[PDB]
Amino acid sequence: AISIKTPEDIEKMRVAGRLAAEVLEMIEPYVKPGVSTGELDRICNDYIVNEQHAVSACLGYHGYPKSVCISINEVVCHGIPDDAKLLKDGDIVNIDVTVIKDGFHGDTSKMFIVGKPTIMGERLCRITQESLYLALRMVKPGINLREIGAAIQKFVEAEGFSVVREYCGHGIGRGFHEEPQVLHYDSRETNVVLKPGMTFTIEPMVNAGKKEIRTMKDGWTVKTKDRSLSAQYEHTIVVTDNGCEILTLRKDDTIPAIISHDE
């Protein structure tokens, strides 16, 4: 019973998606060795509230205490900004942003590499983004979400990496999380034929080591069980009549905003 957005709803999601992307573009010059993740989160929240006139969807959500999630190295997701935690040379860092504007959500994340990359960190981030991009190139009416999940997993595993099972992409709109689930791996349970006007995220988490994860005792932070590096990228999109439109595109993305499968 999946939600179909109107043209007017989609325009509001273009606005909210642009805002979420713009948080990531804004924060970039601050993501440097020696900065604290607590400071990055304050910069983001101040920007969202005071400049964008929007709200963070994460703040207070199930009690989450901060405005963005900042996940470093072996942290898979839900890293909590902390004034004591300083970024350092070689770190891979996900910043995941969700804003609400005019009732609609925009949800996106990217990796930043701090200082001189490690070769493995760079490779892991690259393959993770590539897995998102290959999925985006498949989105069009009539395709099944199952085909997309299977393709992400095939691609990632061929690189000797693994796909986290637990924290899938999602429908999004007036609600933060809506149907459907967007799995990043193959499942016989998945049977969702895309229709124009569906809006959802794709947000693969890819581990350099094994797929298993662990939640820390703080009740939020998720790490790889084997302490291998983990990376994630996320975009919010709308299914169009012949493809998709990426609502959270940034200037540094290297895929077109509008992907068309028509002749």
Ligand X SMILES: COC(=O)[C@@H](CC(C)C)NC(=O)[C@H](C)NC(=O)[C@@H](O)[C@H](N)c1ccc(C(C)C)cc1
Instruction: Report the interface residues with Co ion, using CB under 5 A.
Output: 96, 107, 201, 234
Which residues is 250 bridged to in the sheet?
Answer: none
Of 36, 130, 143, 167, the one binding ligand X by CB under 6 A? 167
Q: Which two tokens stand for residue 81?
A: 């900004």
Give the whole-angstrom CA distance, residue 42 versus residue 103. 23
Give the whole-angstrom CA distance, residue 217 versus residue 233. 25
**Amino acid (1-letter code) at residue 218:** D
Q: How far is the CB of 4 from ligand X (least distance, A)?
A: 20
Q: Which is nearer to ligand X, 73 or 98 (CB)?
A: 98
The reply to whether 218 sits in an annotated binding site is no
The reply to whether 91 sits in an annotated binding site is no
Which residues is 239 bridged to in the sheet?
Answer: 244
Q: Does 234 participate in binding ligand X (rule CB under 6 A)?
A: yes
Q: Does 107 participate in binding ligand X (rule CB under 6 A)?
A: yes
How would you label 42-65 residue by residue, b for 16+ Cβ within 10 Å and e otherwise? bbbbebbeeebebbbbbbeeeebe
- Classify residue 147 as left (phi > 0), alpha (psi -120 to 50) or beta: alpha
Q: Answer yes or no: are the C-beta atoms of 70 and 92 closer than 8 Å.
A: no
The reply to whether 203 sits in an annotated binding site is yes
Of 8, 29, 62, 218, the one binding ligand X by CB under 6 A? 62
Q: Does 230 participate in binding Na ion (rule CB under 5 A)?
A: yes
Residue 167 interface partner, choices Na ion, Co ion, ligand X, none, CB cut-off 5-8 Å depending on type: ligand X
Of 12, 170, 211, 223, the one binding ligand X by CB under 6 A? 170
Q: Which of these segments, 25-33, 62-70, 82-90, 122-130, binds ligand X (CB under 6 A)? A: 62-70
Q: How many residues does the chain have?
A: 263
Binding positions for ligand X, rule: CB under 6 A: 58, 61-62, 64, 69, 78, 96, 98, 107, 167, 170, 203, 220, 234
Binding residues for a divalent metal cation, as ranges, are 96, 107, 170, 203, 234
